[PDB]
Amino acid sequence: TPSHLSDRYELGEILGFGGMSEVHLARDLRLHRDVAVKVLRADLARDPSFYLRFRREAQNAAALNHPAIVAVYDTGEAETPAGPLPYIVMEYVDGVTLRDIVHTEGPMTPKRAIEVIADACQALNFSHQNGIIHRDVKPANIMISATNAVKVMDFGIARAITAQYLSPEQARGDSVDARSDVYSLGCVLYEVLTGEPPFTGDSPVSVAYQHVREDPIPPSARHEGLSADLDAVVLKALAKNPENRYQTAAEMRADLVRVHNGEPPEAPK
Ligand SMILES: Nc1ncnc2c1ncn2[C@@H]1O[C@H](COP(=O)(O)OP(=O)(O)OP(O)(O)=S)[C@@H](O)[C@H]1O
Ligand SMILES: [Mg+2]
Ligand SMILES: [Mg+2]
């Protein structure tokens, strides 16, 4: 990992290293600005059709342009001993994923919470109208800027038209669409509120099963200060039946902005 990709993007700190890539905080030497570069796990997973998933992820996010969605600025690959090293240059978000905020602060204030996810909705609704589906919406792919701004960031598994956060439909290879993301955000909205996903399981299958077989314990019954009006929103988006939940993410937001003010949720039960 040449601390100087293509001789232009000076690598610095390490913002994170998963099981596929290593994201570094870099310096664009030409534009004198800080950027976040994503590097395909130094060849350890660069020979297979994995490079495709990477190239097609850079371009699947490059197709979108919205504040809440991390922008892509450039792609490429630098040459190194073992071969090509595909990198992606994104906007830098000095922040924290929600996975973190829910780990060192516990649950978010209902209103704080409502606020975030409503912004996340705005990003997905856009992503949708542009024919992109983020098949991977989880607390670890939504970031909170150092100025409390929301950023949605992982498209590695997104297709243009760890299952604690997957939809029944997406559980199997079934129908995965707009509403799937809608169902996912419902889990996030749920964790940021209780401090946990609607369903916990010792093994993946027990969880999947729970998603498509058990009603999500109402938020109120799971945590303190929870407006049974907020329950109406959470449990709606978590409805096992696509048709019975919000059809668009803007429709979900609409019912979040409602609760945020003081209005009645146009959600049932
Ligand atoms: N633009 C960015 N700015 C700051 N940190 C970022 C940025 N993009 C990613 N990160 C950090 O890098 C971590 C890994 O991001 P991902 O893109 O989801 O990683 P990944 O290699 O796809 O790992 P997986 O497959 O999602 S488990 C994040 O959870 C952040 O801490
Ligand atoms: Mg991640
Ligand atoms: Mg990914």
Short mmCIF file of C-alpha atoms and ligand atoms in Angstrom, two decimals:
data_model
loop_
_atom_site.label_atom_id
_atom_site.label_comp_id
_atom_site.label_asym_id
_atom_site.label_seq_id
_atom_site.Cartn_x
_atom_site.Cartn_y
_atom_site.Cartn_z
CA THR A 1 0.00 0.00 0.00
CA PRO A 2 2.17 2.87 -1.48
CA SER A 3 1.69 5.84 0.80
CA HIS A 4 1.27 7.77 -2.48
CA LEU A 5 -1.29 6.21 -4.90
CA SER A 6 -0.79 7.13 -8.59
CA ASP A 7 1.72 9.60 -7.22
CA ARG A 8 -1.14 12.00 -6.48
CA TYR A 9 -3.24 10.80 -3.50
CA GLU A 10 -1.03 10.94 -0.41
CA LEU A 11 -2.21 8.31 2.07
CA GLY A 12 -2.31 9.17 5.78
CA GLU A 13 -4.29 7.74 8.69
CA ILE A 14 -6.37 4.62 8.43
CA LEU A 15 -10.08 5.20 8.83
CA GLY A 16 -10.87 1.53 8.63
CA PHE A 17 -10.03 -1.89 7.21
CA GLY A 18 -12.75 -4.45 6.62
CA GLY A 19 -12.76 -7.87 5.08
CA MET A 20 -12.54 -6.43 1.56
CA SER A 21 -10.87 -3.04 1.66
CA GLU A 22 -8.88 -0.58 3.71
CA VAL A 23 -10.09 3.03 3.69
CA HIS A 24 -7.41 5.65 4.20
CA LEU A 25 -7.54 9.37 4.83
CA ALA A 26 -5.54 10.94 2.00
CA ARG A 27 -4.35 14.21 0.57
CA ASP A 28 -5.14 15.26 -3.00
CA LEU A 29 -1.84 16.86 -3.94
CA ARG A 30 -3.27 18.72 -6.93
CA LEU A 31 -6.41 20.08 -5.30
CA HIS A 32 -4.85 20.56 -1.85
CA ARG A 33 -7.82 18.91 -0.15
CA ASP A 34 -8.33 15.89 2.14
CA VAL A 35 -10.02 12.86 0.60
CA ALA A 36 -10.96 9.34 1.69
CA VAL A 37 -9.52 6.65 -0.58
CA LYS A 38 -10.80 3.07 -0.57
CA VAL A 39 -8.27 0.41 -1.60
CA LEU A 40 -9.27 -3.09 -2.75
CA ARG A 41 -7.79 -5.30 -0.04
CA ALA A 42 -4.21 -5.25 -1.22
CA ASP A 43 -4.65 -8.05 -3.80
CA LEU A 44 -5.78 -10.54 -1.09
CA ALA A 45 -9.14 -10.34 -2.93
CA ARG A 46 -8.27 -8.53 -6.17
CA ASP A 47 -7.75 -11.38 -8.68
CA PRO A 48 -11.41 -12.68 -8.76
CA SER A 49 -14.56 -11.04 -10.14
CA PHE A 50 -14.12 -9.07 -6.91
CA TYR A 51 -12.43 -6.31 -8.90
CA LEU A 52 -15.69 -6.05 -10.80
CA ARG A 53 -17.73 -5.69 -7.65
CA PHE A 54 -15.28 -2.88 -6.77
CA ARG A 55 -15.23 -1.12 -10.15
CA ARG A 56 -19.02 -1.47 -10.39
CA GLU A 57 -19.39 -0.11 -6.84
CA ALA A 58 -17.35 2.94 -7.51
CA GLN A 59 -19.54 3.59 -10.58
CA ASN A 60 -22.76 2.64 -8.84
CA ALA A 61 -22.17 5.40 -6.26
CA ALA A 62 -20.65 7.77 -8.83
CA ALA A 63 -24.06 7.78 -10.46
CA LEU A 64 -25.56 9.52 -7.44
CA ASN A 65 -24.97 13.10 -6.28
CA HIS A 66 -26.65 14.14 -3.03
CA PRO A 67 -25.39 15.58 0.28
CA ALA A 68 -26.36 12.51 2.34
CA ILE A 69 -24.63 10.13 -0.05
CA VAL A 70 -20.82 10.08 -0.05
CA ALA A 71 -19.66 11.31 -3.43
CA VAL A 72 -17.07 9.55 -5.58
CA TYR A 73 -14.44 11.85 -7.04
CA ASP A 74 -12.12 9.51 -8.91
CA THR A 75 -11.10 5.85 -9.44
CA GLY A 76 -8.05 4.06 -10.77
CA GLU A 77 -5.37 1.67 -9.63
CA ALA A 78 -1.68 2.01 -8.85
CA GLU A 79 0.86 -0.57 -9.96
CA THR A 80 2.53 -2.74 -7.28
CA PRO A 81 4.57 -6.00 -7.19
CA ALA A 82 1.56 -8.38 -7.01
CA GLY A 83 -0.28 -6.36 -9.65
CA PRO A 84 -3.07 -3.77 -9.88
CA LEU A 85 -4.50 -2.05 -6.79
CA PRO A 86 -7.97 -0.58 -7.57
CA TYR A 87 -8.68 2.44 -5.43
CA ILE A 88 -11.65 4.78 -5.04
CA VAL A 89 -11.45 8.45 -4.08
CA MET A 90 -14.49 9.55 -2.04
CA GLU A 91 -15.40 12.71 -0.14
CA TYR A 92 -13.99 12.59 3.36
CA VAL A 93 -16.42 12.35 6.24
CA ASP A 94 -14.71 13.06 9.52
CA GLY A 95 -17.25 11.17 11.53
CA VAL A 96 -18.66 8.02 13.00
CA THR A 97 -20.92 5.23 11.69
CA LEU A 98 -24.13 4.74 13.61
CA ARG A 99 -22.82 1.37 14.74
CA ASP A 100 -20.41 3.37 16.89
CA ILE A 101 -22.72 6.06 18.20
CA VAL A 102 -25.01 3.25 19.37
CA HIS A 103 -22.04 1.63 21.10
CA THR A 104 -20.56 4.47 23.14
CA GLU A 105 -23.74 6.40 23.82
CA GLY A 106 -26.32 3.67 23.85
CA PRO A 107 -29.67 4.64 22.27
CA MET A 108 -30.23 8.05 20.64
CA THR A 109 -32.79 10.59 21.83
CA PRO A 110 -36.07 9.77 20.04
CA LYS A 111 -35.94 13.20 18.41
CA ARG A 112 -32.25 13.05 17.73
CA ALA A 113 -32.88 9.59 16.25
CA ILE A 114 -35.95 10.56 14.21
CA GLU A 115 -33.84 13.41 12.86
CA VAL A 116 -31.00 11.21 11.56
CA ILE A 117 -33.01 8.42 9.89
CA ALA A 118 -35.27 11.01 8.28
CA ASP A 119 -32.16 12.39 6.59
CA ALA A 120 -31.08 8.88 5.65
CA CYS A 121 -34.48 8.40 4.03
CA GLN A 122 -33.90 11.49 1.93
CA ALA A 123 -30.73 9.84 0.62
CA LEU A 124 -32.35 6.53 -0.21
CA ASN A 125 -35.41 8.07 -1.83
CA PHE A 126 -33.01 9.90 -4.15
CA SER A 127 -30.95 6.74 -4.71
CA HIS A 128 -34.20 5.05 -5.65
CA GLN A 129 -35.43 7.60 -8.21
CA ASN A 130 -32.04 7.18 -9.85
CA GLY A 131 -32.58 3.47 -10.22
CA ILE A 132 -30.14 2.40 -7.54
CA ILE A 133 -30.98 0.00 -4.72
CA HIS A 134 -28.74 -0.13 -1.67
CA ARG A 135 -29.10 -3.76 -0.73
CA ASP A 136 -26.90 -3.10 2.27
CA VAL A 137 -28.50 -0.57 4.64
CA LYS A 138 -27.18 -1.06 8.19
CA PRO A 139 -26.04 1.05 11.19
CA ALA A 140 -22.50 0.73 9.93
CA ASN A 141 -23.17 2.33 6.54
CA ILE A 142 -24.72 5.55 7.78
CA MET A 143 -22.24 8.12 9.08
CA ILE A 144 -22.75 11.13 11.32
CA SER A 145 -20.55 14.03 10.22
CA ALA A 146 -18.59 15.94 12.87
CA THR A 147 -21.26 18.62 12.43
CA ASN A 148 -24.12 16.12 12.93
CA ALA A 149 -24.74 15.63 9.18
CA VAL A 150 -25.87 12.26 7.80
CA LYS A 151 -23.95 10.32 5.18
CA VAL A 152 -24.91 6.99 3.65
CA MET A 153 -21.88 5.17 2.26
CA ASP A 154 -21.72 1.52 1.25
CA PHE A 155 -22.64 0.42 -2.27
CA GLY A 156 -20.48 -2.68 -2.62
CA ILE A 157 -23.61 -4.85 -2.69
CA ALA A 158 -25.91 -2.40 -4.49
CA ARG A 159 -27.50 -3.23 -7.83
CA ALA A 160 -28.91 -0.67 -10.29
CA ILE A 161 -32.47 -1.44 -11.50
CA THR A 162 -24.83 -10.50 9.00
CA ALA A 163 -28.55 -10.45 8.32
CA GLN A 164 -29.66 -8.61 11.44
CA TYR A 165 -30.82 -5.90 9.04
CA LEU A 166 -32.11 -7.84 6.05
CA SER A 167 -35.68 -8.11 4.79
CA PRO A 168 -37.60 -11.36 4.54
CA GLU A 169 -37.77 -10.83 0.78
CA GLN A 170 -34.00 -10.20 0.65
CA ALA A 171 -33.52 -13.06 3.15
CA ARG A 172 -33.87 -15.58 0.35
CA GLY A 173 -32.97 -14.53 -3.21
CA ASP A 174 -36.54 -13.17 -3.47
CA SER A 175 -37.72 -9.78 -4.70
CA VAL A 176 -35.30 -7.02 -3.57
CA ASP A 177 -36.53 -3.49 -4.26
CA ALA A 178 -37.19 -0.05 -2.84
CA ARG A 179 -39.23 -1.39 0.01
CA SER A 180 -36.41 -3.74 1.03
CA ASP A 181 -34.27 -0.71 1.92
CA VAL A 182 -37.36 0.74 3.55
CA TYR A 183 -37.51 -2.38 5.74
CA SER A 184 -33.83 -2.10 6.50
CA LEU A 185 -34.02 1.53 7.61
CA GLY A 186 -36.78 0.35 9.90
CA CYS A 187 -34.29 -1.85 11.69
CA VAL A 188 -31.83 1.03 11.98
CA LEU A 189 -34.60 3.31 13.23
CA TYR A 190 -35.32 0.53 15.70
CA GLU A 191 -31.80 0.06 17.02
CA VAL A 192 -31.02 3.76 17.28
CA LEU A 193 -34.14 3.80 19.46
CA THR A 194 -33.86 0.70 21.62
CA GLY A 195 -30.17 -0.03 21.40
CA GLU A 196 -30.73 -3.29 19.52
CA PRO A 197 -32.15 -4.80 16.30
CA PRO A 198 -35.76 -5.98 16.25
CA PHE A 199 -34.35 -9.51 16.25
CA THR A 200 -31.26 -11.03 17.85
CA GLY A 201 -30.16 -14.57 17.18
CA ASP A 202 -27.26 -16.75 18.20
CA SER A 203 -26.89 -17.92 14.58
CA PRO A 204 -27.79 -16.21 11.27
CA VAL A 205 -30.66 -18.57 10.39
CA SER A 206 -32.42 -18.04 13.70
CA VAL A 207 -32.37 -14.32 12.90
CA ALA A 208 -33.52 -14.61 9.27
CA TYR A 209 -36.31 -16.88 10.50
CA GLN A 210 -37.33 -14.27 13.08
CA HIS A 211 -37.51 -11.51 10.46
CA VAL A 212 -40.01 -13.57 8.46
CA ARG A 213 -42.03 -15.15 11.26
CA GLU A 214 -42.16 -12.87 14.31
CA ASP A 215 -43.55 -9.41 15.00
CA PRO A 216 -40.98 -6.85 16.18
CA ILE A 217 -41.48 -6.28 19.91
CA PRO A 218 -42.93 -2.73 20.01
CA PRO A 219 -40.20 -0.09 20.63
CA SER A 220 -41.99 1.16 23.75
CA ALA A 221 -41.99 -2.34 25.26
CA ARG A 222 -38.27 -2.56 24.46
CA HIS A 223 -37.10 0.83 25.72
CA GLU A 224 -38.12 3.76 27.91
CA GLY A 225 -39.10 7.15 26.45
CA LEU A 226 -40.80 5.80 23.38
CA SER A 227 -43.85 7.43 21.88
CA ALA A 228 -46.35 4.69 20.90
CA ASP A 229 -46.73 7.06 17.93
CA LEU A 230 -43.16 6.23 17.08
CA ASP A 231 -44.08 2.57 17.46
CA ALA A 232 -46.61 3.12 14.69
CA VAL A 233 -43.82 4.21 12.34
CA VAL A 234 -41.21 1.59 13.28
CA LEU A 235 -43.53 -1.41 13.19
CA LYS A 236 -45.06 -0.17 9.93
CA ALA A 237 -41.76 -0.14 8.06
CA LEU A 238 -40.99 -3.53 9.62
CA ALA A 239 -44.20 -5.07 8.28
CA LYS A 240 -43.35 -8.49 6.84
CA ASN A 241 -45.41 -7.68 3.74
CA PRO A 242 -43.80 -5.19 1.33
CA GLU A 243 -47.24 -3.87 0.43
CA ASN A 244 -48.13 -3.33 4.07
CA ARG A 245 -45.11 -1.09 4.81
CA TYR A 246 -44.10 2.34 3.43
CA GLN A 247 -43.89 2.04 -0.35
CA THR A 248 -41.24 4.73 -0.77
CA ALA A 249 -38.60 6.04 1.63
CA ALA A 250 -40.02 9.54 1.29
CA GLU A 251 -43.32 8.16 2.43
CA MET A 252 -41.54 6.82 5.53
CA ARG A 253 -39.80 10.16 6.08
CA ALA A 254 -43.16 11.93 5.74
CA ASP A 255 -44.38 9.88 8.70
CA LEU A 256 -41.21 10.67 10.62
CA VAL A 257 -41.38 14.41 10.02
CA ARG A 258 -44.95 14.10 11.24
CA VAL A 259 -43.99 12.45 14.55
CA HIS A 260 -41.04 14.82 14.86
CA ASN A 261 -43.33 17.82 14.89
CA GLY A 262 -46.23 16.62 17.01
CA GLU A 263 -48.57 15.27 14.40
CA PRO A 264 -50.35 11.86 14.34
CA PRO A 265 -48.64 9.07 12.43
CA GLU A 266 -50.60 8.12 9.30
CA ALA A 267 -49.52 4.66 10.40
CA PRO A 268 -52.07 2.15 11.82
CA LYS A 269 -52.42 0.19 15.13
N1 LIG B 1 -15.78 8.69 3.04
C1 LIG B 1 -15.42 8.17 4.11
N2 LIG B 1 -14.94 8.96 5.13
C2 LIG B 1 -14.51 8.51 6.36
N3 LIG B 1 -14.50 7.23 6.70
C3 LIG B 1 -14.97 6.42 5.70
C4 LIG B 1 -15.42 6.78 4.44
N4 LIG B 1 -15.81 5.67 3.73
C5 LIG B 1 -15.57 4.66 4.58
N5 LIG B 1 -15.06 5.07 5.77
C6 LIG B 1 -14.64 4.31 6.97
O1 LIG B 1 -14.31 3.05 6.59
C7 LIG B 1 -15.08 2.08 7.30
C8 LIG B 1 -15.27 0.93 6.32
O2 LIG B 1 -16.17 1.42 5.25
P1 LIG B 1 -16.82 0.42 4.16
O3 LIG B 1 -16.85 1.15 2.77
O4 LIG B 1 -18.23 -0.09 4.49
O5 LIG B 1 -15.83 -0.76 4.23
P2 LIG B 1 -15.80 -2.10 3.43
O6 LIG B 1 -14.44 -2.39 2.99
O7 LIG B 1 -16.95 -2.16 2.39
O8 LIG B 1 -16.25 -3.09 4.61
P3 LIG B 1 -17.59 -3.98 4.63
O9 LIG B 1 -17.64 -4.95 3.45
O10 LIG B 1 -18.77 -2.90 4.54
S1 LIG B 1 -17.84 -5.03 6.34
C9 LIG B 1 -16.35 2.81 7.61
O11 LIG B 1 -17.33 2.08 8.43
C10 LIG B 1 -15.69 4.14 8.01
O12 LIG B 1 -15.10 4.16 9.32
MG MG B 2 -18.62 -0.86 7.36
MG MG B 3 -18.77 -2.91 0.79
#
